[PDB]
Amino acid sequence: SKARVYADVNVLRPKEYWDYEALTVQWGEQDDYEVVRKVGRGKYSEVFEGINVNNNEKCIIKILKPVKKKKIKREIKILQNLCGGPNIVKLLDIVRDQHSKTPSLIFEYVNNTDFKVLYPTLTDYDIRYYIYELLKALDYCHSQGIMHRDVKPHNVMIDHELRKLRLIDWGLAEFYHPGKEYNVRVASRYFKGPELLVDLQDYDYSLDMWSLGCMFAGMIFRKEPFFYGHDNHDQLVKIAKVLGTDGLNVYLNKYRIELDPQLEALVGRHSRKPWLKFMNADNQHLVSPEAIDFLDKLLRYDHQERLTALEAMTHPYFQQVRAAE
Numbered sequence: 001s002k003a004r005v006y007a008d009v010n011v012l013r014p015k016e017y018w019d020y021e022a023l024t025v026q027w028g029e030q031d032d033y034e035v036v037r038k039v040g041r042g043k044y045s046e047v048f049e050g051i052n053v054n055n056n057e058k059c060i061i062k063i064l065k066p067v068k069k070k071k072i073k074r075e076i077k078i079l080q081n082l083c084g085g086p087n088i089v090k091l092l093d094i095v096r097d098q099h100s101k102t103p104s105l106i107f108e109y110v111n112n113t114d115f116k117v118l119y120p121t122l123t124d125y126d127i128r129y130y131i132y133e134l135l136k137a138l139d140y141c142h143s144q145g146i147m148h149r150d151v152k153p154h155n156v157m158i159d160h161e162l163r164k165l166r167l168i169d170w171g172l173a174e175f176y177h178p179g180k181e182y183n184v185r186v187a188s189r190y191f192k193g194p195e196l197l198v199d200l201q202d203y204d205y206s207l208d209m210w211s212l213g214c215m216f217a218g219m220i221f222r223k224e225p226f227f228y229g230h231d232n233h234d235q236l237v238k239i240a241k242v243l244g245t246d247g248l249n250v251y252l253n254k255y256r257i258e259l260d261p262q263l264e265a266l267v268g269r270h271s272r273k274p275w276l277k278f279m280n281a282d283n284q285h286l287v288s289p290e291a292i293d294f295l296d297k298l299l300r301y302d303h304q305e306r307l308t309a310l311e312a313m314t315h316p317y318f319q320q321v322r323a324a325e
């Protein structure tokens with residue numbers, strides 16, 4: 001399987017661009033950036049609100065937990081490649097603790113509001129607007145040969161007051177190369193596409209469009225996560241109990257995928273649950289025919305059948321957003 005778009009990006013570009021292992025990091029000054037307050041944490045880093053002592057300007061200090069040299073260069077190269085494109089987190093500097101060599105990445109500051117607190121207050125229009133902003137990040141990075149591979153609310157920073165969106169955490173991101181077999185141990189469980197769950201290694205940008213779709217489905221339906229699986233096999237069961245088993249069946253045969261008998265048994269047999277079955281009084285005001293139609297073209301088993309980030313941005317759903325530009 002190849003990408004239906006931007007397949008030749010890293011092919012027509014110099015080896016400098018995509019060859020991240022040849023990166024030689026030009027380290028900055030660790031004294032320039034003081035920690036003010038903790039603002040988050042994850043498996044691979046701790047994150048702090050910071051200050052630049054030169055200019056008194058706020059920043060984000062992302063202190064990294066012991067990481068392989070290979071993986072950290074991947075994150076940096078991608079960050080440097082994408083630095084400047086639409087709604088991408090801007091990497092300001094790269095520094096290290098002299099004694100222990102622990103790297104820190106310094107980012108632009110964003111006054112983010114947690115999605116568990118923010119999202120319930122988003123109106124019909126705000127949702128349209130912020131997904132559109134995310135779509136700009138996605139098409140940009142896709143256009144540059146990068147798949148984010150970890151699209152979720154936690155990686156989407158939002159200052160509601162100033163209406164600014166930044167796509168963050170490019171720790172799982174990767175250069176797309178035509179027919180290169182990739183590790184399916186990427187994204188976070190509730191946003192893993194069916195390609196990763198069934199061991200289809202030759203995936204592409206399309207992966208991020210599934211992830212995007214789970215995120216979107218949770219926002220309009222007010223049910224986050226939308227696909228709540230307990231583990232990788234249960235994650236697929238949850239998808240199958242929505243999109244239906246037949247669509248799964250045709251998808252698997254098209255790519256010559258054989259499922260594990262353990263998994264195939266677990267999945268079982270299920271009919272399709274129409275999207276309108278997720279409507280209620282808590283969410284009636286965010287669900288529309290346009291929302292449903294957009295959601296519908298994103299959440300497809302077949303990665304080749306999903307809307308591309310560019311196609312998605314032109315959807316009548318986002319029309320009023322486009323007119324305001």
Ligand SMILES: S=c1[nH]c2c(Br)c(Br)c(Br)c(Br)c2[nH]1
Nearest residue numbers: 039040041047060110112168
């Ligand atoms: S974790 C984590 N949290 C976080 C925040 Br709150 C911001 Br504003 C920013 Br800009 C970044 Br890069 C991260 N990572």
